[PDB]
Each structure stands twice: as C-alpha cells, then as structure tokens.
C-alpha cells in the first residue's frame, strides 16, 4: 500500500501569494500522480495528472511537477475562489491511494461581524421547544466568542454553533448560534441577549429582544 503524505496539512496565505504544496510517495510512482481541488460542498475537481499535465479548462495558475517519490503543486497567484482542500493521488499500482489533503485558507484584513438575534416563531412554541438564533455575518478572523444571557443568567450547555467555510469572494466566515430552551423555560423569562466578542469590535456587541416586546 503506497503512502502519500502531503505537506503541509493546512496553510494560510494572502490573495496573490505564490502557494506551494508537496506530496511524498513512500515508493517510486514515476509520473503517475494526480492533483485534486475540493471546494466546500462540491465534488473533487481533477487539476493535474501525469504529475504535470493540466486537465482541460483548468486555470494556468495551477501547476504540478515531480518524478519518482517527490511531487509539487503550485498556485502562482492565489485567488479568493481557490479556498479548498487539495489532494494528491498515486495511480501506479492498485490500490490507488489519496494523500490526507492540504486545507488552504486565505489571510485577509480584520472584518467585524454583523450580529442579528432571532426570537423563536409562534409556530415552534406550539411544539414545546424554543430555538433562539444569533447570526455573526461576514467576519474575519474565524475566532469569535458568543455568550447567551436569559434575564442576566449566562446560558451554558444549551447552545450549538455552526461556521460556514471561508467565502469564495470576500474570504469571510459566518457563524450561527442556536440556544434551545423548553417553551416553559422560555415563557418564564423576559430578556434574550447574545453578546459577541471579536477582534474587529472595539468592545463586545450585544443584540437582544424582550419576549413579546
């Protein structure tokens, strides 16, 4: 079983940088190596095969080189839409093997989140559960602290976050936090707050509502 170990695992780089990824084959695999881009939520795209042949329609800014054990994948000028995980594959012997992949993230300037709070719908309160949502939109970098308060009481263990992958144009993250309460617990309290700490805010931003106003 021919190992393919990629270097590095993940990489941060600025728009326009020359990016370089290496893949080490544990045995000679001649030029029988391909390179793959997988953008978030998409199918793998073949970029390079026979170590250096560009697949049709693929942008010239992508190149491969190598022969034997050591292979290189280059992006000449990193574009915002090149956010993806990159894969090397060996196809000399069965079984064909992938590398563990290289996750390519973009460095950009700080962008403070826009923060929005959402009360639970009347429709959902009929079900006996209440979901309160905090949206942190279009921020960089990723590190963001969301705190839920209900009538001044910090809520811990009754929320779950989800972060999108870096946007293909502006290289920003978005984050949603959901606080799940029983209807009973929800109907007993008045003030619903999420407080957002982020590098691009001079101090923590709070969005809130009063149940019913």
């Amino acid at each position: 079983d021919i190992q393919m170990t990629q270097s590095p695992s993940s990489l941060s780089a600025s728009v326009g940088d020359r990016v370089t990824i290496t893949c080490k084959a544990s045995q000679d695999v001649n030029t029988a190596v391909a390179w793959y881009q997988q953008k978030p939520g998409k199918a793998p795209k073949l970029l390079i095969y026979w170590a250096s042949t560009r697949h049709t329609g693929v942008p010239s800014r992508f190149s491969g080189s190598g022969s034997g054990t050591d292979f290189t994948f280059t992006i000449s000028s990193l574009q915002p839409e090149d956010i993806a995980t990159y894969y090397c594959l060996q196809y000399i012997n069965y079984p064909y093997t992938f590398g563990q992949g290289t996750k390519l993230e973009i460095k950009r300037t700080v962008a403070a989140p826009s923060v929005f709070i959402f009360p639970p719908s009347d429709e959902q309160l009929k079900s006996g559960t209440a979901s309160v949502v905090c949206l942190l939109n279009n921020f960089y970098p990723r590190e963001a602290k969301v705190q839920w308060k209900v009538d001044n009481a910090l809520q811990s263990g009754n929320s779950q976050e989800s972060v999108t992958e870096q946007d293909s144009k502006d290289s920003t993250y978005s984050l949603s936090s959901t606080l799940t309460l029983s209807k009973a617990d929800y109907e007993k309290h008045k003030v619903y707050a999420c407080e957002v700490t982020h590098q691009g805010l001079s101090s923590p931003v709070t969005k809130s509502f009063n149940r019913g106003e």
């Binding site: 594959l89 429709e123 949502v133 949206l135 949603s176 799940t180």
Partner: protein, 214 residues
Amino acid sequence: EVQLVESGGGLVQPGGSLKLSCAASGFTFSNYWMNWVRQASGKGLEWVGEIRSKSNNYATHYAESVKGRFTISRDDSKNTAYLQMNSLKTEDTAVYYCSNRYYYGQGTLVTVSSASTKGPSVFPLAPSSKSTGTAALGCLVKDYFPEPVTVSWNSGALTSGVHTFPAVLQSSGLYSLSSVVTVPSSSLGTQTYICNVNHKPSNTKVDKKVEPKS
C-alpha cells in the same frame, strides 16, 4: 458537457445492502475506466475501486477496506456504472462519488444506521424592526435524520448574501440546519422571501415565507 449522475444513496440498516448507480453522458463510455471514491463527513477522499473497459475483460480492483463486500460493474449500452454494497457497517457512512478518472459526479450520501428516518420542521428567522439598511432573515430546518436537506431561496433566483450553515448533530441524535440571507432593509415590505427546504429521505418538501413579525 461531461455529466455523471449518482443515485441510490440513502439510509440502510447495518449488515444490510444498497446498490449505487452512475448515469454517464458526453463521453464514449466504454473506452473509460469508471471509479468510486467516497468521503466521510469532515474527512479525506478514499478510493473504493475501479472497473476497466471490455477490452480489459471488465477487470475490477478494490480498496482493502471494502474488498469482498462491494462489487463494481458497468452496462455500456445504458452508459451506467454501479456499486453493489453488502455487509454495510457504520464506518462505510459517506458521500460516494463516481469518476471516469477525469470528472466526478455531484455525489450521493449512504448512511448506515439503525436510527429512524424523520422529516424536519421549518421555522422562520423573521427580520426585526430596525433602520440599519441591511436586514437578515432565514429558516431553521429543525429535527431531521438522516442528512441531507437542501435549501434554496425564491426557487434559486436569490443567491447573493445567502449563507447555508452546516447541519449540527443535536443531543437527541437529530440534525438541525439554518439558512440566512442579508437583503436591503427597504425590500422587506415588497419582496417576498421564500426558503425551499427538501429532505428527500423523509419525502418532505416545504416552502416557508419569511416576513417581518406583526
């Protein structure tokens, strides 16, 4: 012009079986070697196997992890490749891709679980009464199994400012998912905002109008 359409993915008992298909067009099918690759959630690409052309006696090769259990075959008259899966395990849970070595299909998800199918509830994330003007609204697709749900806005005509967050596995072993869109604040009286939620596994299709709350 090259198309690869996977089908036959879904929920299945451990120990059970499932047959995947791959409808190919835009290339002389019989000359190409078809491959299956699969991807577990937040993990690497794994090669499954490859079937060669008729002139190679339809020779098949398999990854160590699936040999004995999986069977690749082709039908050159129907321009289709197949993956027959037997003695399925939870480890086999992944999106399964079909390749002619040059292109991949959009993929199809196989979930190997004893957990039951369950259709989501769709709840509005209603925009607030506020002047600043960018406004945010959305849909909460709550309490479904298995993955996936798809979300579009206004039948796919509204795509700019749209964030569809990854599903989170809740404590109950059911998935939840949010989709939000920022829009001009001055459109909130006049432009209709509808989120189209589909959960094919449970046969659930919802159009949820999200508007400002009275």
